[model samples]
Target: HKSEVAHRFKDLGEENFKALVLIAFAQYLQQCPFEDHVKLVNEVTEFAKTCVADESAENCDKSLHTLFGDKLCTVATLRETYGEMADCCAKQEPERNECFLQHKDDNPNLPRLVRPEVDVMCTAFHDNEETFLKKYLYEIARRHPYFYAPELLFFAKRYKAAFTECCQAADKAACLLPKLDELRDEGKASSAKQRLKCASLQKFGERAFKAWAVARLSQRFPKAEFAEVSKLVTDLTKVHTECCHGDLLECADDRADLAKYICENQDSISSKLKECCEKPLLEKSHCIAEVENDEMPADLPSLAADFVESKDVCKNYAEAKDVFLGMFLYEYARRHPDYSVVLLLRLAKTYETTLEKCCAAADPHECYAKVFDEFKPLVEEPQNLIKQNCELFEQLGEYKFQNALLVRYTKKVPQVSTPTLVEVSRNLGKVGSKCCKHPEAKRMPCAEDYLSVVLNQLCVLHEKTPVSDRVTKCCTESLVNRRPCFSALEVDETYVPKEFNAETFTFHADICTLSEKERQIKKQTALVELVKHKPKATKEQLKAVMDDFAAFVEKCCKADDKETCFAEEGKKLVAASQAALG
Candidate 1:
């Protein structure tokens, strides 16, 4: 038994978490009797020390047994509080300490502890003493799963001291039961402290402790309108509010109802979550609970607010800051599917931090308007850059993607030779492949660090090469003037991209028949081919043509006369392409 516990928490790099767990223990101990505080603290402190040093002992955690004695539940609470701090365990050493240390601030006021008034305790007890003890245990154990087990069991055992006196009273009912309100006050001040910490666990938990409900629902129904998202926020907040009062069972009831709603409206949720919808109702919680954040839906409704809010954000925020910020985080996450939760939290907090200054200004609307306006292109650049680079490696395969890169830069720097461009693009493609994924905690770290080395080396080589004024300036001027002078780089105008032409058009009904995934792969290939064909076309123009092509497939594939559909529409598409190039 201890083996499992030791294995679970050992070497979890949760070393700093023990520091926080000590704080949680100390605070809960403060609620205990003044004498027990010394006893409880000494024991937990020993366990704390043991974890750092002698955790090699299989029963190193046995100190908790002595602290709780046989009550067991208080030790159960320790396990629970440790579970809450698991998020902190992942932080840097200093951050882990800071994360765990913050739990001291989490003390929340639980409402009136509603244990049975004196009559029910005695009435149930009239049958037998065991009945009396179990009733007292049930009252406490139901509310608190952990610490109360030992502490409250001690109280439950001692509860018999008053019982014999009350049972022998002249008028048993009247004499035995004290005033209901005062009886509750006694429990509140005394044994009920066991639950105060438990209640706080439900009331507040932030940062990564933040809103997965909003984030998950937003990603789950990525195409959902803002109004629907707002509607969802209302629903979630109400469900959230239910449990904050300490009766989580009430909240669980509402949650199960929402789970039913989620399952019933299957198409609106992600396909992965759809599996949860298919499961039996009881198991639905487990299935949905296990579902990680779904990759953002492919056709996420184009970011409408783009958090375009200056006044609207302020107004909505004033109405409900959590709802607005939840939407803020959700929409931002949807906009950049590549972004990790940590970055997304930082992103939302950045907006919130900006608002801290802006919200106080005389003109908050115009203030955040400019503030948000500036940040848009800042994030948009990296968003598209990462997406484009990652898509090339994943969809185009390393060979064709590198070939694509060579075509791009040589079209800009025609003076650079076939062999040189191949080497440059080949290495750059390798960097793109390496940098565009994982270790999601930081702000695009690999892309920020690794992609530049290849580009920097390319520019170093270009320093000596005989390239155009545009290419030379991008290399030379951006070196001092800016490293970003290559922004909006146009084709060299003198050179043509080779081997990409109308001859490359190999259309077939296969485009209509393949799985959506296979169809998307074909479409991506076409976009690359089109870029090579019309090197003069701007990126937006290429995307526009791709959209037209995608639309043509949607319409043409459904037509009864398939070849006729392709022949008739395909000619105009080519015509549209020429017009697009012009």
Candidate 2:
């Protein structure tokens, strides 16, 4: 039925079609035979476009037929197309070498996988993957429940090496259809279970890509099986799936545990790989290792290096760590003022580490020393540093996770503003406020409760500052001298009482005024300045200024001096300036 085809192809998105060549071009090499490889690319492209167009039709069954019914043009056809492309890649360099007057500069950016020979394998297949994914991947995900059906069937029909010729029979060995069938039970399982499997399979697909990626790597070094790569994918799927689900949200503890995993595994995976190789592993390809430092049985390049090189990877992972660490720290030290200092310091350290790792390649030589110099001062000044660190962590969180996940699920519809923040102030504020009240807050060491302590301490500092001291600091001598020497401000503390909750403090003042003597002296000084500047005054303006000044000065000497004194200085200036002009 056309519905079958439509459903099979429905899940594809434009993201899936962007060629991997661009990734190689940007990250590894500059030129690839993407043009020469266009015919193969066309197969994936045409298949994707047809899938998009047909799936758009409402007569679901008819659309499926149009999308998938072409006997030769099914998933197998697309897979076969990639297979031919792989073969073409293998021939490219040799063919070039025959005519070769050194075409090295032509594709200078293209990385020679440390072993150089592996270019054959990487270019052999995954070269165009970046293009395919960018252009076509999400088209498949847009339609979910139905897309699953086609995905399952397509994997079944073409699990063979349609991506390659010799690999055709290997797909039969993979027999991915059987495993997919269990996953495709459709109505038999709950949506959560189905969604879980779908998510898991999506991860599985990621692993397959990773393994395929490693095989290409092996072409440069030592080859490992895709199955082993799948195992790491399995572990990561387990780790990430738990954090994200229909109703579940990750707590700060979960995030911390995940970060620990990322830190440890990132170290372990790359170290093992480096012992056996010269070239760095593709950064994102080590995502699973970044999550959990489970020992890789064989040599693998460092995943950390991958994150360092790719801005996207650095951005994605840095927040992942911050969100977890920040929340946990906040929750532990809400009530204890002393803990706040420690928590702030901890965050500063973590943030500094992230900046260091992320920017390692940028500085290459001074990475560690530079990070220390950049970050050390934040912790040195406890009061200001704590405030900035908390805010910075909050910003990193929004940049990384909140925008990507929470807002989408909670809002139910697309936001008019496509989530500008990764972490929203709303969530951070809510979390910060609640953490103080949490049971865990009580258990935190007195030194770990950062926000409550810092605010309270600052409040105490504000209380200790004398109003006279504040006045001296706040007012300029020029403004102060303008007041009447004899004027006396009446005291009325109750009239403008400090209005703030015990939890928060407020500053207030009332009944403040200058005596007549103060006011006259001040006005005289103002008049003097006005006289000095009057020579530069404009013509017509000077006449009106004298009239205003006369009225103001006249009012100052009137019975009700309260209002009059305030206007006297301004009036004196106007009259003086006008009189000077006349």
Candidate 3:
């Protein structure tokens, strides 16, 4: 028994036992990856199973602490390195098949394989390429020749053949033969006076095509006169219109050639129109003939200065003109590709003034409808411009944009925002947080107590002050209206009020169940009455007071002991009160 509690280092080949345990500890660490505690338990369990009866058959606690100091880090590293190796190998089809069989013989707790493992599989591909396309460069250059070299290099004679091939490729992609057929059908439809009213460019997809052509032409020929181009385009369009109006085929050939030149360069024509189609301004031709270095009208220069400075007026009017003409040309071009920007600008001034008037009106929707009515003749054909210009829709604002399609050409009704609706739905529409605090009184006052003081002061003032017409001169305004200064409690109003919005009065009171205030006052009054009566009171009166006071206690007391003790005490008080009240 003494040996059981002592430090018993047994000599049963204890010399050889440390060496045996150390070997087994290494093997246990190789298998378990959970943590040191698990590995300790594992090694101790193995030791117990394998220990010889003669050797130290103790629990392996001493060896666990000794060996774990060095093995924990190695055990962790072994798991991580093995994991990385398994991941890289698993993606290979053959290796994965091999892994599946290897996994069966391996420890179930250790990971078998992994994948999307490492970046090694595609190393060669990353080194040799920029993008996936660069790998097949020669074949792609041959197949997509026009896409690679777009411009017709005029000075470089070698590129002519390439330009033709490029054009051929572009033509294949452009596939305008069907569109040309549609254009022919459109011309026939628009020239019939009855049908011209119904042709709208928006019905077809020409708005995007025109915007594309505009951008391309604007970039390629920035200096070309738009007004001149528009004039030429309009003249050609008139001829095309005539041909569509049952004119002879001889005029058609010339119209066709002109149409090609105009459409291939519409933006320049639009710009030309922007410059040339001047407002009908007054000119001071006669006076300016004698003008020297500064002989021009001083007032005229200042007036011109003011006019140019009125940018808001200019921009608003400009936007109106542009939107109207742009919408119009989009319609005409869709029906008759030969139509030029010149005819569009010719109508722009009227629209610009009308737009200015519409914007100035109080109700924009009503104004939009009023101005839109003028388009009845032109509305027969709508333009794809509304579809192509998302920016136009955005300018209409979310409410109008949502309902724009539903609004009739001759009528105006606005739509609601689907995005705004989604946002409102997400948050259930309520968004603000609330904060509340009590006010600081000069003397820290309970709000209800302070209100009680306020009401009591009002009652006291009314009792002291008497009103009479005869006594009007005798009383000051303050004395006649003598009242509590509820204003004394003035505070900076809290953003939120600090009161419950519910009725807090007693519920279910009956004849037997008196209200709390009534119970307290009743008990006091009855006792006082008995005290006044004293011993001289009649037996019946004393008995009544006694019972009434006791009833108050029973109704008001919250606990059983309180109800009984106060009821008995109330009887004594009532007897005394009867003597006094009498």
Candidate 4:
């Protein structure tokens, strides 16, 4: 690990170089358990001293050649990766490691390494376990040049363990195939913790946010020096980690605490953040959110790189679905933060589903190539509407935000009950409050998640009601189109809600036997039903009706004469519901 950095080891000498090689080998050995193979140590060490003494391609290739038993550097992967290192070695001592770092993984021309289906892989493993496992390590090492020794070691052992168990199975294919997906899931979860940290740096200014992470991490890892913690945070916050899985709530809370920490601890932090602290409410967070985290890491894989032919998509997908989707999100998110996580998730899912179908199609390339064209129109229109909604919510805060949607919904669908519209607006307002005030990554997801409630409740409320065309359209539009279609519609002044059926006011005693969660659900279902029935009831009036039922249920459920109490309370509840509607 220490050997990779250009300046960490003393510069330009055979003695320092041999020591560096030993250190690097020690790290490699740590990852590679001694039981596997230690014989290569002698030949590798011999080549390390020989190659560094003169920086010879012949000797470097010879070193690896002996390790591989006379195949030498004809192994194209080593030839290219190590070939470049030898070329870099020709440079002056001070810049030599830097040159090696720059071109170390220049194996771009090599065909993508792909593992075959599980059955094929397992059979290959059984035929020669050492060769197959070594092949696995070779492929993993070459493909993931970004990893340091420890990370590589961990993955190597994990993959070996998987094969070690599955190779013994009666039906190896069935037992081992899910292992790829399993590996992906595990990899992505670790990757997400890292991505969330990367987003934190971008969403909040880098230095200020990092200090907050350091402060918190130091508490948990007291033994770690400041530099160690800082280095750890730095490694975790890179672009490679972005696009995988991490808990947004945990991240949101961390940033919220971070913002507070920055404001309170301003005496020590950079003066640049002082202006943001002086800003108000959501504006304050928005200002900090715009702060840059320097440039994104160079040579980030592009989204287009994930595009594969239908013939090969399954191999690419199964081999590493996490890398495929996670990489796309990292690229897409940094460029387009305007798209909410909900939408981003939809896009990822669409890409996955499309691949799933297209790979099975008569012609897969065209299907794979054309997924975005179909997805673009659906996403673009809804994006503008959501963008506008978040902007408006941030400006208005909670109270007026609800009122705005309240007025809009009230006029848009007249046949829907006032209480139902009130509920809709409140839900939308709640979404805005919860979402718009947060850091950039979380805002869209919260807004979109809560906004779905409005359309869902409306569609169900007007399921049989005489409603306007836009109401029907809003209900019927695909998931992407529904939000905007509902948001962009005009006033529906023509239709009036039908008179409430007397049956709608009836409350049953069936709730008396329900479990607590079931009871809570029943009460919610009752309220939703009541709002639809009493179409013109005000929010206060509806609350009163809900409260009236609450008290009636409470009294009867505790009573010795439950049936008698229910009938008595039921009469009073029905009377209150009738009066509230008027």
Candidate 5:
């Protein structure tokens, strides 16, 4: 009966066959006695047309037969056609299978695997998976009602490799049916316990395509297997299965339509991959490593050599030129690892320091933009760095994190004293470790936490401290104005001697805004610088001046308006220092 029904539809054109089936369903619906029987008949006819319009009547009949059975021959005839069913499908069932074997000869897309090879595999898998899944599910249902939708997923989990292959199979049901039937046949022939062996696979078939791609790509790079490359493959597979529709795979073609689809939706593909990689590892790939210092390439060739031939040329450049460039590279590398090395070299070679020229403007971003507009070809995506790290953007990110952390730490330890310069620096290092440690590929989208923790301690302590306050500032400023001013200041209260002038210290009303402890710290810092520069001065001479400075901070520096208190004591100390120098 099934063969007769199939034979009848074989000669009719696709539309004619679909119309006849709709008439048959409409007649069956008219036999109902319900008040809406005409409406039901019309609904059935429209449904038949829709099914025919979207997919071949043969596919519909096959789907219906898979869900129901061949006992309904009239309907079954409307749904079953087999030749050239898939875009990549060959005329014969045997020919359909040989497609994968032919892939090795001279495939255009397939290539040697590397850390970068995952992209192509992902592209292929994404392209051809939907149709295969549809064909597989239909074949499974048509062959036996052994598994429900939930049970099918569970069974798939048990047969991961076969399932993955089935999902990406170009020939869809043809590629997978034989294997499913083989298992069914083996199960029928075996004892209940022995049937467990049927679940084991002799091969993963086309499912092995991804792993094959990974293996061949990673052949030379052993580290790739357990690293980001492996995770990328896993992540892509996870997304493929999770998002794919079982029936859509049947429509997906390997080369023409599939290629076009991928090319057209490149941005969509990238966004999905990015989102997949960005999610917490619990549901995604766990292979991404935290960004670490050791992982960073040690000798990133600076493009500085490209712009200047000699150190003499660079030395003559304005102060902020080098500073701005260094900051740009550091931030740029953190965000875009792919272009990091290339951009670094190009920047070092082609980039001119615009800080001295642009920062003089009231709006430095506009100034930098105007200066860079001429040389835009030298820097790609320059706005990303400038928008993130320029002026208030950089300051606010750092301060926000600092403010959040300080508030949190104070809530936990209210009695804790303010951190010293060394403590602040140490805390900043910890902040960087926490914030900047993600793998570049998997870096967190936001760096506010890292910036805040590092800058908060530095900001809170040095917010009011002038760059010129430290004696070593000028020494270091000559080379570069890195090294935050307070970092070099003395933290030990006991370091200052008690033998010098004992008058209360005084500072300018507008200038002396620091807390008493901070004021004491600065004067001691200035005293340390004086001693370092005047190294030839005897220990006794230095100790006497230190005592005078310490006593001035303790006395004259304690009051808000102690200018007169400081003048006499400061005069006495300066006189003593001059005498010691002689």
Candidate 6:
């Protein structure tokens, strides 16, 4: 028998035998793309070349013969048993199902194997009994992750009705198959959550359904402006929660009935939401703003522990104003589409100090409400509001432009001296004349970009100046020299600061390539270097630590608050590292 097997390869020829074995090997890794098979073949060829280069000719030949024999024999056994069935197996699930059904009668062993995909297909194609079809579809759904269970249930419940309708002219499968295909396409287009919502609405009734929709809207849009309307959405959910009985699944079969009720009662449901959720959340948000902060004085800005933190008082106030101001700014910008987002943001922030001052007392809501009503008339007339607020906008614009220049440049060279407030003020008038001279509508629309241009034009040192030649060098250089020196750096026409905003550009060519990915990679590499002391730690362990550290950096570093510094974030990493070591 061994001699007969050995003689088979001689009869077949080496290339032909190799080809037959490779066909089976391709079937074994059928899921792999064609490109991957080519890559594997090339890799094996290189391995053979390396062996021939390193070993004696006899040894090299012996090693390759053993490797080839092992793989060839494995593939050859599979080829004999499976044969042409492996060709059909290489197709994707849908096509493979069709192929298997066509050839099933020819191969007695084909239906013996359990494949959920094929099982469902075979049942649908041949099984006509209603109870059997429902049972098998449910079973397939329960057993298979790829099968969408709820969607299967949705159609299975309706199959009896659809079958009866189709019995008049065609087969039950004919009626069900087209709809099943349509539902599958629909399911792919929508998310699981959306499908579940639709199902839940139908099952529970409109009240239960609308409650869920409104509650979601409430959470998503947090501002007073959106909260006013969103609360009504939440209210609708509350009213509907009563209609759905004890446990939801007990009444799950009534889902279609529930959808009908929702469609019928849409008007009554939406009106309730408008009355309750929308009005309440807006009132509460307005209440929060108007409620007096008697604990902190109007001079809260002076009490900060650090220079930067002190400046954040205005920034925080600006953020608070944004909630309401955004509503107006967005609408106005829509009305006047030429305006930039940055310019609108600046224009909106200009009113922060005014709102904060006016709404700081015990009876502030009444005061604020009155101011809002008065402003409403102006708010409706965009041109009048712009003209009335033009001087204030110009003043705030100059202040913001100067502050941005100082903050951005100092972050790059922290020790770099900034011009005094008096110096900033003197330059402000001159800068304004050049950048803010256009009429109210024209100037306000392009004001932020103009300010950025002027600030960069006036704020920093020349581009060609070396690091050593700068007015302020890095801290390491000063530490070694044992002296502290600082001087104010003035900007000229050649000066261009680092791109702290979209409007500015970095002066140096080298700095341009330090993108977000580079920063993240450098940070990850540094953490890995720090963890290298634990040489026994596996790659998985190191990777887990780096991922956790990266998340911590993102959470703490990306925060707007300067108080939560990198040192604070790094401290947690140190603590975690120590805990891991111990």
Best by lDDT: 1
Off by over 4 Å in 3: 1-223, 259-582
Off by over 4 Å in 4: 1-441, 449-468, 475-482, 489-502
lDDT winner between 2 and 5, please give it.
Answer: 5
Give lDDT tens digits, candidate 1, residues 370-390: 555555655666567666668
For each candidate, what is the lDDT?
Answer: 0.54, 0.33, 0.31, 0.53, 0.36, 0.38
List, in order, the clash count of every candidate structure. 8, 87, 35, 2, 28, 11
TM-score-based ranking: 4, 1, 6, 5, 2, 3
Residue pairs of candidate 1 with colliding backbone atoms:
71-150, 73-146, 73-147, 74-146, 74-147, 77-146, 305-308, 478-482
Tens digit of per-residue lDDT, candidate 3, span 1-582: 212101122321332223223322323333333244334544543454444332444543333223233333334444463553344232444343234223222123434323221133133224543222122222222222121010011111222232233334534324433333344333222223212211212222333323323322322233434344244444544543443332222233344445445445544433333222221111111111111111111232222122223334334445555433443333332322222222232233334566567657675434544443454433222222212323434465333332222122101101112222222222111110000022221111122222223233323333365332212222222210211122222222221212221122111223236754465334333233222223233345645655654555455455445545444554555445435445
Off by over 4 Å in 1: 1-212, 226-255, 292-306, 309-320, 359-366, 369-582
In candidate 5, what are the lDDT values of residues 1-582, reduced to their tens digit? 223234333444343333334322222221222223224334444544555454444435443323112212223222232112222232333343333223212112222223223334335446765333332333333332222222233233334455467647675566555565555433332222111112111122223323332332222122222333344444444433321212111211221233343234434323223343444212122111122211333444443342233233333445545433433444334333333233333443344545455445575544444433443554434334323323332354543333333333332222223344324433443444443445433222223323323333333344454322343342233111222232234423323323443332334432356864465445533443343334345546655766665576567657755787667666776677667766
How many angstroms is residue 462 displaced in model 5 relative to the true structure, after the best TM-score fit? Answer: 21
TM-scores of all candidate predictions against the true structure: 0.30, 0.17, 0.17, 0.30, 0.20, 0.20
TM-score of 2: 0.17
Worst ten-residue run, lDDT, model 2?
A: 502-511
> Which lDDT tens digits does candidate 4 get at residues 1-582?
212122221232433333223333332222333333334434545555555454543535332212323222222343343555445444554454345345434234446667687878877877987657555554454444333333344455567788889878888767776786577545533333343345445544554344444433332333333444455456434322331122222233344455565567544433456687886432343455444322233454555555643357656776766555544444454444445544555566678788788767787777787777656865676656656887888787665566556545665565565566666666667667666677764555456545555455567567767456677877866554566676677755454555656564555567788765466545544454554444456667766776777789889888898887888788877876687667
Across residues 430-533, which tens digit of lDDT does each residue of candidate 2 receive? 33443434443232322132323322222233346433332233222221121111012222222222222221111111112455435433433332233233
1 against 6, candidate with superior TM-score: 1
Candidate 6 lDDT (Cα, 0 to 1): 0.38
lDDT of 6 at 233: 44
Better of 3 and 4 by lDDT: 4
